[PDB]
Enzyme design. Structure first.
Site, PDB file in Angstrom:
ATOM      1  N   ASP A   1      34.982  41.628  32.998  1.00 31.37           N
ATOM      2  CA  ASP A   1      36.488  41.934  33.070  1.00 31.37           C
ATOM      3  C   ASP A   1      37.295  42.939  32.284  1.00 31.37           C
ATOM      4  OD1 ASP A   1      38.888  40.409  31.871  1.00 31.37           O
ATOM      5  OD2 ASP A   1      39.670  41.384  33.428  1.00 31.37           O
TER       6      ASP A   1
ATOM      7  N   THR B   1      25.802  34.673  39.262  1.00 34.98           N
ATOM      8  CA  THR B   1      25.947  35.513  37.754  1.00 34.98           C
ATOM      9  C   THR B   1      25.876  34.860  36.882  1.00 34.98           C
ATOM     10  OG1 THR B   1      28.939  34.353  37.477  1.00 34.98           O
ATOM     11  CG2 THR B   1      27.809  36.368  39.293  1.00 34.98           C
TER      12      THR B   1
ATOM     13  N   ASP C   1      30.401  31.494  39.276  1.00 37.92           N
ATOM     14  CA  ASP C   1      29.375  31.702  40.557  1.00 37.92           C
ATOM     15  C   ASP C   1      28.235  31.842  40.619  1.00 37.92           C
ATOM     16  OD1 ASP C   1      28.428  33.753  42.740  1.00 37.92           O
ATOM     17  OD2 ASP C   1      30.696  33.008  43.290  1.00 37.92           O
TER      18      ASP C   1
ATOM     19  N   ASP D   1      51.808  32.093  44.940  1.00 38.81           N
ATOM     20  CA  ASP D   1      50.270  32.960  45.554  1.00 38.81           C
ATOM     21  C   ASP D   1      49.950  33.061  46.614  1.00 38.81           C
ATOM     22  OD1 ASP D   1      51.023  35.033  43.285  1.00 38.81           O
ATOM     23  OD2 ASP D   1      48.805  34.715  42.250  1.00 38.81           O
TER      24      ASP D   1
ATOM     25  N   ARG E   1      51.435  42.493  47.941  1.00 36.64           N
ATOM     26  CA  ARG E   1      50.095  43.033  46.867  1.00 36.64           C
ATOM     27  C   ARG E   1      48.880  43.513  48.317  1.00 36.64           C
ATOM     28  NH1 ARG E   1      51.072  40.274  41.518  1.00 36.64           N
ATOM     29  NH2 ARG E   1      53.787  39.595  42.676  1.00 36.64           N
TER      30      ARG E   1
ATOM     31  N   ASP F   1      36.912  36.633  29.189  1.00 38.27           N
ATOM     32  CA  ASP F   1      37.505  36.307  28.569  1.00 38.27           C
ATOM     33  C   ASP F   1      38.026  34.351  28.547  1.00 38.27           C
ATOM     34  OD1 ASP F   1      39.305  38.292  29.560  1.00 38.27           O
ATOM     35  OD2 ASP F   1      40.986  37.536  28.306  1.00 38.27           O
TER      36      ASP F   1
ATOM     37  N   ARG G   1      65.372  32.914  35.654  1.00 38.58           N
ATOM     38  CA  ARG G   1      64.242  31.575  35.692  1.00 38.58           C
ATOM     39  C   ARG G   1      63.837  30.445  35.490  1.00 38.58           C
ATOM     40  NH1 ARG G   1      58.738  35.462  37.038  1.00 38.58           N
ATOM     41  NH2 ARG G   1      59.611  37.705  37.723  1.00 38.58           N
TER      42      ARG G   1
ATOM     43  N   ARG H   1      61.888  37.482  42.389  1.00 39.90           N
ATOM     44  CA  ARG H   1      61.506  38.381  41.235  1.00 39.90           C
ATOM     45  C   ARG H   1      62.314  39.152  40.929  1.00 39.90           C
ATOM     46  NH1 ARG H   1      57.534  38.925  38.725  1.00 39.90           N
ATOM     47  NH2 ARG H   1      55.713  37.025  38.829  1.00 39.90           N
TER      48      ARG H   1
ATOM     49  N   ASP I   1      40.718  43.388  30.878  1.00 37.95           N
ATOM     50  CA  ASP I   1      41.338  42.807  30.027  1.00 37.95           C
ATOM     51  C   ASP I   1      40.893  41.946  29.143  1.00 37.95           C
ATOM     52  OD1 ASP I   1      44.338  43.882  29.019  1.00 37.95           O
ATOM     53  OD2 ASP I   1      44.548  42.224  29.268  1.00 37.95           O
TER      54      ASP I   1
ATOM     55  N   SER J   1      56.856  31.749  41.485  1.00 37.95           N
ATOM     56  CA  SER J   1      56.977  31.534  42.525  1.00 37.95           C
ATOM     57  C   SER J   1      55.639  30.933  42.437  1.00 37.95           C
ATOM     58  CB  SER J   1      56.976  34.060  42.091  1.00 37.95           C
ATOM     59  OG  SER J   1      56.041  34.221  41.065  1.00 37.95           O
TER      60      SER J   1
HETATM   61 MG   LIG Z   1      27.535  32.528  37.080  1.00 42.18          MG
HETATM   62 MG   LIG Z   2      40.593  39.161  31.459  1.00 43.55          MG
END
Ligand SMILES: [Mg+2]
Ligand SMILES: [Mg+2]
Ligand SMILES: [Cl-]
Ligand SMILES: [Mg+2]
Ligand SMILES: [Mg+2]
Ligand code: NA
Lengths: 242, 242
Positions: free
Chosen positions: B8, B222, B219, B177, B119, B205, B137, B130, B10, B175
């Protein structure tokens, strides 16, 4: 007595859709020695900054982005109201609910996102979505001529909210605007009425009926002039003030 | 069997909301002499350029912006995918219209703008829009917790379009998704499962539920490692590979 010069920007001070020439920039500043100058446009402050410079609030006595609903006088921000405070939340919703219920009914090739953009003094409404790509925009644009989407849309809204005191304008390829009666360019005249000017000159390149300068040109508060091109504007300012 | 490391971006290789450090960047390029590297994050490619630098597609063997919807491998683009292409214009129109009609029926104190955010791999739907302010909000979320507005909306959407490969996850204050099933971080695995890696290491993280890395971490393909910061990712890499 003391006077003020009001200039539309696109097509009046600049060539259409382009920055101003420094030849005109210097002329305007030479003219500022003789009387006060101001500018007004429908674009946001950022677009006006792009077309006339960052220091624009510092080089013009008045700066009126978004037809004047953002207003600077002598470097400082004035007095402001938005569309929600003026119309009230119930009419806003009733209008938002209608536009969504209407767009859900339109049959289109592609639809995307941002169907209502809430601006400071208008609701931009796009049947396809402002999030559209550049290709999807031209494609929707061309179909709108053939089957009169936006036109028929604006007709239903004029009828459904007749008397609620709104104006509906269509511009560009994908959208139309919805704004309170009188929130076109003569809105900024609110900020120059009480400042003691004997004559207020206005210049605009679309003074024809149905143009973005017409109502401010025909307003009794303005001595309006109809300008053909930036050079014409310098042609006319040369004749009155020198 | 050869191995591959996926991070990842960030929180794992960078400090949150920060650009990668020059030490981290250099560290990774030496790890790349022992193993193959790959980065995955939910941000679009340009932001991913802000986090890891503009040459990002040479620096890693795999660059997976937008959870793998965009996919670069060995310097070149390997694949592109959006939800317009995947579900097709027709049914994503049916899904937009249903949402537009449903929002018009909602009696809210304030409605604003950008109710449907488009998106590339998800629709973001907000009954209030938004563009509203934080103060509004909160006003809608205090209404929502009482009157279960997103909960009921998602329900009917789930009864309407879920044999079509759609998932609905409420999130945040206003909202929710709408995305095709399995278009989380797990998506990018389709690009690397065919290159013949025995073990696929994942470093994230936010691997615990409600996290953007939870499902890729859980998963079976992984070998996942929960990481608390970049200092920790480095420490784990050392213990694993040298
Ligand atoms: Mg895994
Ligand atoms: Mg992250
Ligand atoms: Cl919208
Ligand atoms: Mg103009
Ligand atoms: Mg007049
Ligand atoms: Na802008």
């Amino acid at each position: 007595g003391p006077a003020l010069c009001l200039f539309d920007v696109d097509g009046t001070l600049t060539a259409p859709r382009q920055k101003i020439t420094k030849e005109m920039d210097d002329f305007l500043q030479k003219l500022r020695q003789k009387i006060k100058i101001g500018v007004v446009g429908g674009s946001d402050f950022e677009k006006v900054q792009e077309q006339l410079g960052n220091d624009v609030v510092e080089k013009y006595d008045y700066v009126f982005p978004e037809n004047g609903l953002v207003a600077y006088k002598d470097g400082k921000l004035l007095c402001r109201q938005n569309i929600q405070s003026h119309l009230g939340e119930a009419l806003i919703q009733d209008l938002i609910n209608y536009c969504l219920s209407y767009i859900a009914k339109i049959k289109l090739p592609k639809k995307r996102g941002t169907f209502i953009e809430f601006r400071n003094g208008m609701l931009n409404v796009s049947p396809i979505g402002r999030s559209c790509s550049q290709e999807e925009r031209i494609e929707f644009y061309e179909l709108d001529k053939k089957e009169n989407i936006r036109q028929k849309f604006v007709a239903d809204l004029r009828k459904e909210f007749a008397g609620k005191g709104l104006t509906f304008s269509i511009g560009g390829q994908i959208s139309f605007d919805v704004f309170p009666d009188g929130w076109d360019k003569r809105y900024c005249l609110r900020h120059v009425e009480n400042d003691g000017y004997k004559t207020i000159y206005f210049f605009g390149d679309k003074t024809m009926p149905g143009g973005n300068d017409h109502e401010i040109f025909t307003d009794p508060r303005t001595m309006g002039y109809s300008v053909t091109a930036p050079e014409d504007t310098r042609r006319i300012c040369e004749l009155l003030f020198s």
